[PDB]
């Protein structure tokens, strides 16, 4: 039908105008914009999708090819580089690295672009150079490049690439050892023979695992978990990054896998940029699991990420949309713990303390409104945000009145039927109130508790026996008697 | 010569176990058969100081002293003996005998008033007694009638008028007797009182017959009767029903608690309640609770200190059958000793008495109770806890509370989340965060029943106030433990 593309593009653009988080809508919109030839609009649509989602290697590769096969300038070259730089972040991508290398080969002649090629291949190798099946292509392409240059019969570059590859367990390395012997008229030194042979021993070691992947269907999660384990016991940080990544490209929706990888980096070789990177990638691949946002905020805090960045990240976390109210309480509590750990409490007043209190009010209102309106629940039925606030105010801020207010609020939402709650507040008054307030609290407790009144009773008697007048003890015995009768 | 040796034997068995009641009645039996008058009398004295004597034993002693009384000094001493006799239980016969014997003193010693004293007091005790008081009214009017002088008769008239205003058995018979006796007309005012008395007598009939139809001790019947009289709420009549119930049921400790409490909460009289408490620990000295109640009474009514101390010592020397009971009474005494301390001075005589009493209690439990029970008595170091709570909160002394908690935690109390948290909360209140962290770390390591709860508390504490580092170490400990 005539002009159907125009109308369907309008339709999809409007459907995205309401629900921006529609992946298939972006994919469709982009293919139709390509068929109509609206090039700049394809570029924009692609940019918005890539800023919302991780793109697979095929989508990244399509966009890269379109920008490359359309580039007529040196500035276009720098912009293409920028696009590659953005493309490598999402997942492990051997082909993207290959294309980046070869496309960068065009950059020679321009002064600073021999090193540019070597940088691209070097980072390519550092990333996937160990890849059992796809690294070989990168080693080979890098060597083809150095061979096509090899100025003045200076084969130290090609030699080095051979010697670095041969010490590494990838497929058909025997073939590379072959081409090397037939190439280097000099002997292949015993360091290279020894390392080559232990490497071949690493191929034979790993064969059953790789063939487990080959046979398996779908995303092959089980096989990746077995390989993850095996490599994690063998304990090479490089090789466990590699298998975590290889498993993650195929299993990137599995949050617990992100947590395993995240946790290994986060706790064991905590290099800032790498863990912050992997956390960000986790919250882009599985934004529905608040745990990922929590560990990410904890990671940022641990690594001294600037204040404003953490705040903005929290805002993204709020907006991610979780399926349980306990999750909104959870992320709010994470943010508030961060805010509290920001305050010095030994000064009359603070800028940071006021931000903490303000964030508490905001958190409570947000649970009153957004979470209730979307769930018909409070998220914390037992007012834990308020509890933590009262604790802070009483124990750290000398502000006992606010704590009393907050516990008023806590008890009014039906928490007064619970002995545990009464004892939580009592312990607060005992900690930072006075004996009068503890008495009031425990009396009220004796007359409100529904689950375990005898427990509050015995605490009351204990308190008066320890500290109250004989009149006080007598009143206590009467209340408890009348209550438990 | 078997009597000689059997007496010697009983004296030996009393030399070992002085709290053998039947041994005393037997010893006295034999000493009487032997004519050892002096030894009979102080066998009677020692027994009467150990136990309450029933009405009959008191009557034997009284009859013997009376039929052996040969001068006026014996008369006054017999009076003293009666004075001691009435204290133990309710004793209508003894009150009657006390009156009749007091009649012998009329001529001499200005003691015509004495007879009226004895009979008035006899009335105050059992004058309201539904079945046995009539005997006492009758005897009182007999004496007054026989010493009527010039027919003034206002003593006999008044006595009749007082009996008729009270519901006693077959007063209808005395109402008639009075009319026949009275030259004048029974007044309008006593007539209404007699008729109201008829009302309440017919009211009480099914309860009195409840006692009669039932076999003794009619505890239930007595408990039901006590219930009714207490619902009517007359203090005289419910004291009376409590005493009548107790004479047959003096071994029922819960009954002494009921009566003791009724007076404690409601009557609000020192002499009455303290009497009932003393009599309670004499009848059932084996229920530590009675001693507790009693000490509390003494504290309430401002009883002098040394009396309270001595009563406590008696309490310790009583024999209880449970390790927990010695903790209970020690706690009673220690709470008492604490309520004597003005905690707003740096040091005190009363505070040092408290502390020294604490050391005494811990040592006494480590020694007497452990060696006699093969137990700690206090398994959960309750006395030690209370000492810690006091030292921390009421004195400025936090160090001692920490020590006391070493001792508390070292006998297997370290497996328990409650204990760990008790120490924690104490440390939270009067220690510092450092010690709370230390405490809760060790708590997650040691707790066996509810380690997850302790883990919660740790995480909550570090979230509320600890560094990020502290939060991470906490999560590590927790996860490692609950793994």
CSV table of C-alpha atoms in Angstrom, one decimal, chain B residues 126-403:
chain,number,residue,atom,x,y,z
B,126,UNK,CA,-16.5,-14.3,117.6
B,127,UNK,CA,-19.5,-12.3,118.7
B,128,UNK,CA,-20.7,-12.4,115.0
B,129,UNK,CA,-19.9,-16.1,114.6
B,130,UNK,CA,-23.0,-17.6,113.2
B,131,UNK,CA,-23.0,-20.8,115.3
B,132,UNK,CA,-20.6,-20.5,118.3
B,133,UNK,CA,-21.1,-16.8,119.3
B,134,UNK,CA,-24.5,-17.5,120.9
B,135,UNK,CA,-22.7,-19.4,123.6
B,136,UNK,CA,-20.6,-16.3,124.4
B,137,UNK,CA,-23.5,-13.9,124.4
B,138,UNK,CA,-25.4,-16.2,126.8
B,139,UNK,CA,-22.4,-16.5,129.1
B,140,UNK,CA,-21.9,-12.7,129.1
B,141,UNK,CA,-25.6,-12.1,130.0
B,142,UNK,CA,-25.4,-14.8,132.7
B,143,UNK,CA,-22.6,-13.1,134.4
B,144,UNK,CA,-24.2,-9.7,134.2
B,145,UNK,CA,-27.5,-11.1,135.3
B,146,UNK,CA,-26.0,-12.7,138.4
B,147,UNK,CA,-24.3,-9.5,139.6
B,148,UNK,CA,-27.4,-7.3,138.8
B,149,UNK,CA,-27.4,-5.4,142.0
B,150,UNK,CA,-30.6,-3.5,142.6
B,151,UNK,CA,-32.4,-4.7,139.5
B,152,UNK,CA,-31.0,-1.8,137.5
B,153,UNK,CA,-30.8,-4.3,134.6
B,154,UNK,CA,-29.3,-2.0,132.0
B,155,UNK,CA,-26.5,-4.3,131.4
B,156,UNK,CA,-28.7,-7.3,130.6
B,157,UNK,CA,-31.2,-5.3,128.6
B,158,UNK,CA,-28.4,-3.7,126.5
B,159,UNK,CA,-26.8,-7.1,125.9
B,160,UNK,CA,-30.0,-8.7,124.7
B,161,UNK,CA,-30.6,-5.7,122.4
B,162,UNK,CA,-27.1,-6.1,120.9
B,163,UNK,CA,-27.5,-9.8,120.2
B,164,UNK,CA,-30.9,-9.4,118.6
B,165,UNK,CA,-29.5,-6.9,116.1
B,166,UNK,CA,-27.1,-9.6,114.7
B,167,UNK,CA,-27.9,-12.8,112.7
B,168,UNK,CA,-27.1,-15.7,115.0
B,169,UNK,CA,-28.5,-19.1,115.1
B,170,UNK,CA,-31.9,-19.5,116.9
B,171,UNK,CA,-32.1,-15.9,117.9
B,172,UNK,CA,-35.9,-16.4,117.6
B,173,UNK,CA,-35.5,-18.3,120.8
B,174,UNK,CA,-33.6,-15.4,122.5
B,175,UNK,CA,-36.0,-12.9,121.0
B,176,UNK,CA,-38.7,-14.8,122.9
B,177,UNK,CA,-36.6,-15.1,126.0
B,178,UNK,CA,-36.1,-11.4,126.0
B,179,UNK,CA,-39.8,-10.6,125.8
B,180,UNK,CA,-40.5,-12.9,128.5
B,181,UNK,CA,-37.6,-11.4,130.5
B,182,UNK,CA,-38.4,-7.8,129.8
B,183,UNK,CA,-40.8,-6.1,132.1
B,184,UNK,CA,-41.1,-3.3,129.6
B,185,UNK,CA,-41.8,-3.4,125.9
B,186,UNK,CA,-39.2,-4.3,123.3
B,187,UNK,CA,-38.4,-1.1,121.6
B,188,UNK,CA,-39.4,-0.3,118.1
B,189,UNK,CA,-35.8,0.3,117.1
B,190,UNK,CA,-34.4,-3.2,118.0
B,191,UNK,CA,-37.4,-4.8,116.4
B,192,UNK,CA,-36.3,-3.7,112.9
B,193,UNK,CA,-32.8,-4.8,113.6
B,194,UNK,CA,-34.0,-8.2,114.7
B,195,UNK,CA,-36.0,-8.5,111.5
B,196,UNK,CA,-33.1,-7.5,109.3
B,197,UNK,CA,-31.1,-10.0,111.2
B,198,UNK,CA,-33.7,-12.6,110.3
B,199,UNK,CA,-33.3,-11.5,106.7
B,200,UNK,CA,-29.5,-12.0,106.6
B,201,UNK,CA,-29.7,-15.3,108.7
B,202,UNK,CA,-32.1,-16.8,106.1
B,203,UNK,CA,-29.7,-15.3,103.5
B,204,UNK,CA,-26.7,-17.2,105.1
B,205,UNK,CA,-28.5,-20.6,105.8
B,206,UNK,CA,-27.6,-22.4,102.5
B,207,UNK,CA,-23.9,-21.5,103.0
B,208,UNK,CA,-23.8,-22.6,106.6
B,209,UNK,CA,-25.5,-25.8,105.6
B,210,UNK,CA,-23.0,-25.9,102.7
B,211,UNK,CA,-20.3,-26.3,105.4
B,212,UNK,CA,-22.4,-28.8,107.4
B,213,UNK,CA,-23.5,-31.0,104.4
B,214,UNK,CA,-19.9,-31.0,103.2
B,215,UNK,CA,-17.1,-33.0,104.9
B,216,UNK,CA,-14.2,-31.2,106.4
B,217,UNK,CA,-12.2,-29.0,105.4
B,218,UNK,CA,-14.9,-27.8,103.1
B,219,UNK,CA,-12.4,-25.7,101.2
B,220,UNK,CA,-14.7,-25.2,98.3
B,221,UNK,CA,-17.6,-24.6,100.5
B,222,UNK,CA,-15.5,-22.2,102.5
B,223,UNK,CA,-14.2,-20.7,99.2
B,224,UNK,CA,-17.8,-20.2,98.0
B,225,UNK,CA,-18.8,-18.8,101.3
B,226,UNK,CA,-15.8,-16.4,101.3
B,227,UNK,CA,-16.9,-15.4,97.8
B,228,UNK,CA,-20.4,-14.5,98.8
B,229,UNK,CA,-19.5,-12.6,102.0
B,230,UNK,CA,-16.8,-10.7,100.0
B,231,UNK,CA,-19.5,-9.8,97.5
B,232,UNK,CA,-21.6,-8.4,100.3
B,233,UNK,CA,-18.4,-6.6,101.3
B,234,UNK,CA,-18.8,-6.3,105.1
B,235,UNK,CA,-15.2,-6.2,106.5
B,236,UNK,CA,-16.1,-7.7,109.9
B,237,UNK,CA,-18.1,-10.6,108.4
B,238,UNK,CA,-15.5,-11.4,105.7
B,239,UNK,CA,-12.6,-11.4,108.1
B,240,UNK,CA,-14.8,-13.8,110.2
B,241,UNK,CA,-15.5,-16.1,107.3
B,242,UNK,CA,-11.8,-16.0,106.4
B,243,UNK,CA,-10.9,-17.1,109.9
B,244,UNK,CA,-13.5,-19.8,110.2
B,245,UNK,CA,-12.3,-21.0,106.8
B,246,UNK,CA,-8.6,-20.9,107.9
B,247,UNK,CA,-9.0,-22.9,111.2
B,248,UNK,CA,-9.9,-26.0,109.1
B,249,UNK,CA,-7.7,-25.0,106.2
B,250,UNK,CA,-4.6,-23.6,107.7
B,251,UNK,CA,-2.3,-25.7,105.5
B,252,UNK,CA,-3.7,-24.2,102.2
B,253,UNK,CA,-1.2,-21.5,101.3
B,254,UNK,CA,-3.4,-20.0,98.5
B,255,UNK,CA,-6.0,-19.3,101.2
B,256,UNK,CA,-3.5,-17.3,103.3
B,257,UNK,CA,-2.7,-15.5,100.1
B,258,UNK,CA,-6.4,-14.7,99.4
B,259,UNK,CA,-7.0,-13.4,102.9
B,260,UNK,CA,-3.6,-11.7,103.2
B,261,UNK,CA,-4.3,-9.9,99.9
B,262,UNK,CA,-7.9,-9.0,100.7
B,263,UNK,CA,-6.5,-7.1,103.7
B,264,UNK,CA,-3.5,-5.8,101.7
B,265,UNK,CA,-5.4,-4.2,98.9
B,266,UNK,CA,-8.6,-3.4,100.6
B,267,UNK,CA,-8.6,-3.1,104.4
B,268,UNK,CA,-5.7,-0.7,104.6
B,269,UNK,CA,-4.9,-1.4,108.3
B,270,UNK,CA,-1.4,-2.1,109.6
B,271,UNK,CA,-2.0,-4.3,112.6
B,272,UNK,CA,-4.6,-6.6,110.9
B,273,UNK,CA,-2.6,-7.2,107.8
B,274,UNK,CA,0.7,-7.7,109.5
B,275,UNK,CA,-1.0,-10.1,111.9
B,276,UNK,CA,-2.4,-12.1,109.0
B,277,UNK,CA,1.0,-12.2,107.3
B,278,UNK,CA,2.9,-13.4,110.4
B,279,UNK,CA,0.3,-16.1,110.9
B,280,UNK,CA,0.6,-17.0,107.3
B,281,UNK,CA,4.4,-17.7,107.5
B,282,UNK,CA,3.8,-19.6,110.7
B,283,UNK,CA,1.2,-21.9,109.2
B,284,UNK,CA,2.9,-22.5,105.8
B,285,UNK,CA,6.5,-21.3,106.1
B,286,UNK,CA,7.4,-23.4,103.0
B,287,UNK,CA,5.8,-21.2,100.3
B,288,UNK,CA,8.4,-18.4,99.7
B,289,UNK,CA,5.6,-16.3,98.3
B,290,UNK,CA,4.0,-15.8,101.7
B,291,UNK,CA,7.3,-14.4,103.0
B,292,UNK,CA,7.4,-12.1,99.9
B,293,UNK,CA,3.9,-10.8,100.5
B,294,UNK,CA,4.8,-10.4,104.1
B,295,UNK,CA,8.0,-8.4,103.5
B,296,UNK,CA,6.0,-6.2,101.1
B,297,UNK,CA,3.4,-5.6,103.8
B,298,UNK,CA,6.1,-4.6,106.2
B,299,UNK,CA,7.6,-2.2,103.7
B,300,UNK,CA,4.3,-0.6,102.9
B,301,UNK,CA,3.4,0.0,106.5
B,302,UNK,CA,6.7,1.6,107.5
B,303,UNK,CA,7.8,-1.3,109.7
B,304,UNK,CA,11.1,-0.5,111.3
B,305,UNK,CA,14.1,-1.6,109.4
B,306,UNK,CA,15.6,-4.2,111.8
B,307,UNK,CA,12.3,-6.0,112.0
B,308,UNK,CA,12.2,-6.3,108.2
B,309,UNK,CA,15.9,-7.5,108.1
B,310,UNK,CA,15.2,-10.1,110.8
B,311,UNK,CA,12.1,-11.3,109.1
B,312,UNK,CA,14.1,-11.8,106.0
B,313,UNK,CA,16.7,-13.8,107.9
B,314,UNK,CA,14.0,-16.0,109.3
B,315,UNK,CA,12.8,-16.3,105.7
B,316,UNK,CA,16.2,-17.6,104.6
B,317,UNK,CA,16.4,-20.1,107.5
B,318,UNK,CA,13.0,-21.5,106.6
B,319,UNK,CA,13.2,-24.5,104.5
B,320,UNK,CA,12.1,-24.2,100.8
B,321,UNK,CA,12.1,-27.2,98.4
B,322,UNK,CA,13.2,-25.3,95.3
B,323,UNK,CA,16.4,-23.6,94.1
B,324,UNK,CA,14.3,-20.8,92.5
B,325,UNK,CA,12.6,-19.9,95.8
B,326,UNK,CA,15.8,-18.7,97.3
B,327,UNK,CA,16.3,-16.4,94.4
B,328,UNK,CA,12.8,-15.2,94.8
B,329,UNK,CA,13.1,-14.3,98.5
B,330,UNK,CA,16.6,-12.8,97.9
B,331,UNK,CA,15.1,-10.6,95.2
B,332,UNK,CA,12.3,-9.5,97.5
B,333,UNK,CA,14.9,-8.5,100.1
B,334,UNK,CA,17.1,-6.8,97.6
B,335,UNK,CA,14.3,-4.8,95.9
B,336,UNK,CA,13.3,-3.7,99.5
B,337,UNK,CA,16.9,-2.7,100.2
B,338,UNK,CA,17.1,-0.7,96.9
B,339,UNK,CA,13.9,1.3,97.6
B,340,UNK,CA,15.8,2.6,100.6
B,341,UNK,CA,18.4,4.3,98.5
B,342,UNK,CA,18.3,8.0,97.5
B,343,UNK,CA,20.3,7.5,94.3
B,344,UNK,CA,20.9,11.2,93.9
B,345,UNK,CA,24.0,11.1,96.1
B,346,UNK,CA,27.5,10.0,95.1
B,347,UNK,CA,27.7,7.4,97.9
B,348,UNK,CA,25.2,6.3,100.6
B,349,UNK,CA,25.0,4.1,103.7
B,350,UNK,CA,21.9,2.6,102.2
B,351,UNK,CA,23.5,2.1,98.8
B,352,UNK,CA,26.5,0.2,100.4
B,353,UNK,CA,24.0,-1.9,102.3
B,354,UNK,CA,22.5,-2.6,98.9
B,355,UNK,CA,25.7,-3.6,97.2
B,356,UNK,CA,27.0,-5.6,100.2
B,357,UNK,CA,23.7,-7.4,100.2
B,358,UNK,CA,24.2,-8.1,96.5
B,359,UNK,CA,27.6,-9.7,97.2
B,360,UNK,CA,26.0,-11.6,100.0
B,361,UNK,CA,23.2,-12.9,97.7
B,362,UNK,CA,25.5,-14.0,94.9
B,363,UNK,CA,27.8,-15.8,97.4
B,364,UNK,CA,24.8,-17.4,99.2
B,365,UNK,CA,23.5,-18.8,95.9
B,366,UNK,CA,27.0,-20.0,94.8
B,367,UNK,CA,27.3,-21.8,98.2
B,368,UNK,CA,24.2,-22.7,100.1
B,369,UNK,CA,21.8,-23.2,97.2
B,370,UNK,CA,24.2,-24.8,94.8
B,371,UNK,CA,25.5,-27.2,97.5
B,372,UNK,CA,22.0,-28.1,98.6
B,373,UNK,CA,20.4,-28.4,95.1
B,374,UNK,CA,23.0,-29.3,92.4
B,375,UNK,CA,21.8,-26.3,90.5
B,376,UNK,CA,22.4,-22.6,90.3
B,377,UNK,CA,18.9,-21.6,91.5
B,378,UNK,CA,19.4,-18.6,89.3
B,379,UNK,CA,20.4,-20.2,86.0
B,380,UNK,CA,19.9,-17.0,84.1
B,381,UNK,CA,21.8,-14.8,86.6
B,382,UNK,CA,18.7,-12.7,87.4
B,383,UNK,CA,20.2,-11.2,90.6
B,384,UNK,CA,23.4,-10.4,88.7
B,385,UNK,CA,21.3,-8.8,85.9
B,386,UNK,CA,19.4,-6.6,88.4
B,387,UNK,CA,22.6,-5.6,90.0
B,388,UNK,CA,24.0,-4.6,86.6
B,389,UNK,CA,20.9,-2.6,85.6
B,390,UNK,CA,21.1,-0.7,88.9
B,391,UNK,CA,24.8,0.0,88.7
B,392,UNK,CA,24.5,1.3,85.2
B,393,UNK,CA,21.3,3.2,85.2
B,394,UNK,CA,21.1,4.5,88.8
B,395,UNK,CA,24.7,4.8,89.8
B,396,UNK,CA,27.2,6.2,87.4
B,397,UNK,CA,29.0,2.8,87.6
B,398,UNK,CA,29.1,1.2,84.2
B,399,UNK,CA,32.2,-0.8,84.8
B,400,UNK,CA,30.6,-3.1,87.3
B,401,UNK,CA,27.7,-3.7,85.0
B,402,UNK,CA,30.2,-4.9,82.3
B,403,UNK,CA,31.8,-7.3,84.8
